[PDB]
Structure 1
Amino acid sequence: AQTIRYGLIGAGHMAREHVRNLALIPGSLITAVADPTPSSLEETAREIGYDVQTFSAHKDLLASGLVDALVIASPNDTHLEILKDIFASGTNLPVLVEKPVCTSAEQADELEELAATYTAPVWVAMEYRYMPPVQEIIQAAHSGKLGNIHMLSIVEHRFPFLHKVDAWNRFAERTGGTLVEKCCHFFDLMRLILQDEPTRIYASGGHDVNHMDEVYDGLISDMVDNAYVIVDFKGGRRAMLELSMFAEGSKFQERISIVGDAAKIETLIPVAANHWIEGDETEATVEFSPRSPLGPEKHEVPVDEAVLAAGAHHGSTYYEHLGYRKAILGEGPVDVTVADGLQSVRMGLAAEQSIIEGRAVEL
């Protein structure tokens, strides 16, 4: 197995999930980790469990000559500046950049121009499509088992945002807002599943429950914690997103349903084991419901135990790394492009704007 040397820029929560997944893939060697918070470097080094060179600044990692590929897992509002440095570095390194790829309309416009002239693989790390149960419903939709598709519903019911370094995720300025930070994944799935582009978005949401009295270094937390979104698409399909960040009692965290003119399909995805009751491992299900003849078929979709244990996104990060590896080695394309990243972000920003202004937003 050809060795790829990975550099991690950002060494927090999600970086450690990247570490655990790369450990499952022969040929993967972390050589370099950059993070301006020493305790993050220590904790990530322990997770890696073998010697790496650490850096406080990403520019030193880029100049290190230690790496064949990068992973960026720093806070959302830092993604553009890190990417700009990579583009100007002359290293020509591949990049897996965590979602959201950026956090504002200005950032998005700039990244679009810059990324156009960069030739190395740039993959946006929206991994949800590779969850085995999600893959089944995408294959169903694309194969025509559902007929012509008209509707897509995504319901996410989960716990409040977790505690992060410097509390970065508690503020819209740093995150893009909830509909970008948490929901870009879902807007991307909408494009993928419907194979269509959005034309109009409306959202209603509020900051109603979570983190209400929390101030950090003189700032008040201002993130939406529940919302509904309706998205219209060019081809006369429509999708709906429901989010609650205070519905963590729900055994199933995600429900995704697709309705076509020949059938319906629905996946239910359990809470990750590390957040659920220690005890009852529940499996994800896919239920296919043809219009005629009546007779829904439901089955469980198992994930390999090691793939599943390595992350909190139901095996998806592992398949993302297989895909990125093939891109680095020039044996595969980038499945999730900058342009996918930009569309999902602009959809999320349009949603955040709709929530504020109480009006639908055109795209």
Structure 2
Amino acid sequence: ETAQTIRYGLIGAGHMAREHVRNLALIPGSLITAVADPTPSSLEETAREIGYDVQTFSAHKDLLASGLVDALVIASPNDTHLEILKDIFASGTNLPVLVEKPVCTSAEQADELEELAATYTAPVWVAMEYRYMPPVQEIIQAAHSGKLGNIHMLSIVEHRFPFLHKVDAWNRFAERTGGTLVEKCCHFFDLMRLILQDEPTRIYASGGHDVNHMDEVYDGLISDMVDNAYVIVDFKGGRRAMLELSMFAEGSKFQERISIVGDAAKIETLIPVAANHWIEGDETEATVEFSPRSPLGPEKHEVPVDEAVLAAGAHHGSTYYEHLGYRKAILGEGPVDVTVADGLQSVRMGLAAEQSIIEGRAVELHA
């Protein structure tokens, strides 16, 4: 049981970086060595969380020259993801990267990243982790095993609280985030491609900035970000999906609903609000419900998460499994489950959707 050891470098050391550290703390062989972030308060809090001594830098290139690291984790703001990847690619360090979603934030960016990512050879994983939520694992297995028959429809409903406060308010601005439908919803456009095993062809969306962040001023600016939307997505093989997002529906005991409908059965999972954002002492569990057409007879069970794994994140235990998988890719004992290609599609879908909200019209996509 000699744990092989991986030395992790964190580039960006804020809210999500600290979720990575709590999760790596549950995985033997996991050691944080370097942490780069140009905001001192961020380095301080992240160092407190790690709980043991680490080298800190205020710039990533220094971290890259340190020789302190076996693998990278990028958790900086969305629009910075490309620069840091270009830099990692040109470093000659050939380091594995776990880069947070969205992998980028514009069409120009995605084009560039597509060409560049081809020549880089080390594991590059886009940190879209929703698929590893245990409840959502079942849903996906069921869909893939043909237990639903031919799949026709996928609905995703997220009802949640306004965008949280982040360092320098980066998440309040379309140009830094890619828009709400890239920032928040890329996870969901990915899930669509994964579950339906198909590529989108058309997308229409209707959304607004109707409720949130109205009294928050940032050097004379208000948030330009969407806080509610419906999205319909058409696919190559005649399947269709729908996304409902509200960022002011936080009263809802269940934050996510995902239903898949095939021609033999339907399946539906309900994901609760994380314990951190919900009332104290009212922890509900996630459910999965299987509903065959014939014979009638729905079966529903709770899908529990290990008390520790659940407590380490606000994404229902997913971050832990993401890291077990990143580890295996780093060691060569497993694949990159969520590629750059995956990331680029999810972003392009979200960008199309942001475009549809602006022009009041559907938008075509290319394979």
Q: What's the secondary structure of 2:256's corresponding residue?
A: strand
How much has 1:165 moved relative to structure 2?
A: 0.2
Q: Is residue 299 of structure 1 aligned with residue 301 of structure 2?
A: yes
Partner of 1:150: 152
How much has 1:214 moved relative to structure 2?
A: 2.0
For 1:23 and 1:156, the matched residues in 2 are separated by 29
Q: What's the secondary structure of 2:206's corresponding residue?
A: strand
Q: What's the secondary structure of 1:250's corresponding residue?
A: coil
Partner of 1:64: 66
Partner of 2:270: 268
For 2:342 and 2:301, the matched residues in 1 are separated by 31
For 2:350 and 2:216, the matched residues in 1 are separated by 24
Q: What's the secondary structure of 2:297's corresponding residue?
A: coil
For 2:216 and 2:33, the matched residues in 1 are separated by 38
For 1:196 and 1:172, the matched residues in 2 are separated by 28
Partner of 1:233: 235
For 1:329 and 1:84, the matched residues in 2 are separated by 23
For 1:209 and 1:295, the matched residues in 2 are separated by 41
Q: What's the secondary structure of 1:288's corresponding residue?
A: strand
For 1:214 and 1:103, the matched residues in 2 are separated by 23
**Which residues in structure 2 correspond to 1:44-83 (within 5 Å)?**
44-83=46-85
For 1:217 and 1:9, the matched residues in 2 are separated by 27
For 2:139 and 2:326, the matched residues in 1 are separated by 23
Q: Is residue 349 of structure 1 aligned with residue 345 of structure 2?
A: no
What are the Cα deviations for residues 127-177 of structure 1, in whole angstroms up to 9, with x where unaligned? 000000000000000001101000000000000000000000000010000
How much has 1:220 moved relative to structure 2?
A: 2.0
For 2:344 and 2:168, the matched residues in 1 are separated by 26
For 1:221 and 1:308, the matched residues in 2 are separated by 32
For 2:349 and 2:157, the matched residues in 1 are separated by 17
For 1:252 and 1:308, the matched residues in 2 are separated by 16
For 1:110 and 1:219, the matched residues in 2 are separated by 30
What are the Cα deviations for residues 273-316 of structure 1, in whole angstroms up to 9, with x where unaligned? 00001111100000000001101000000011111000000000
For 1:63 and 1:346, the matched residues in 2 are separated by 33
How much has 1:267 moved relative to structure 2?
A: 0.2
What are the Cα deviations for residues 156-202 of structure 1, in whole angstroms up to 9, with x where unaligned? 00000000000000000100000000000000000000000000000
For 2:113 and 2:219, the matched residues in 1 are separated by 30
For 2:301 and 2:82, the matched residues in 1 are separated by 42
How much has 1:48 moved relative to structure 2?
A: 0.1
For 1:62 and 1:210, the matched residues in 2 are separated by 39
How much has 1:218 moved relative to structure 2?
A: 2.9
TM-score normalised per structure 1: 1.00
**Which residues in structure 2 correspond to 1:112-191 (within 5 Å)?**
112-191=114-193
| Comparing 261-270 and 216-225, the one that deviates more | 216-225
For 2:346 and 2:217, the matched residues in 1 are separated by 29
For 1:148 and 1:276, the matched residues in 2 are separated by 37
Partner of 2:249: 247
How much has 1:57 moved relative to structure 2?
A: 0.2
For 2:359 and 2:133, the matched residues in 1 are separated by 35
For 1:133 and 1:220, the matched residues in 2 are separated by 37
Q: What's the secondary structure of 2:162's corresponding residue?
A: coil
What are the Cα deviations for residues 71-129 of structure 1, in whole angstroms up to 9, with x where unaligned? 00000010000000000000000000000000000000000000000000000000000
For 2:125 and 2:183, the matched residues in 1 are separated by 17
What percent of counterpart residues are identical?
100
How much has 1:203 moved relative to structure 2?
A: 0.2
How much has 1:334 moved relative to structure 2?
A: 0.4
For 1:19 and 1:213, the matched residues in 2 are separated by 34
For 2:119 and 2:148, the matched residues in 1 are separated by 40
For 2:281 and 2:26, the matched residues in 1 are separated by 25
How much has 1:215 moved relative to structure 2?
A: 1.8
How much has 1:219 moved relative to structure 2?
A: 2.3
Partner of 1:277: 279
What are the Cα deviations for residues 34-73 of structure 1, in whole angstroms up to 9, with x where unaligned? 0000000000000000000000000000000000000000
The RMSD of aligned alpha carbons is: 0.5
| Comparing 216-225 and 151-160, the one that deviates more | 216-225
For 2:237 and 2:299, the matched residues in 1 are separated by 29
How much has 1:217 moved relative to structure 2?
A: 2.3
For 2:289 and 2:5, the matched residues in 1 are separated by 41
What 5-or-longer segments of structure 1 have no aligned partner? none
Q: What's the secondary structure of 2:90's corresponding residue?
A: helix
For 2:104 and 2:214, the matched residues in 1 are separated by 26
What 5-or-longer segments of structure 2 have no aligned partner? none
For 2:337 and 2:221, the matched residues in 1 are separated by 38
How much has 1:212 moved relative to structure 2?
A: 1.6
1:322 is aligned, of 321, 324, 336, to 324
TM-score normalised per structure 2: 0.99
For 2:329 and 2:65, the matched residues in 1 are separated by 22
How much has 1:15 moved relative to structure 2?
A: 0.2
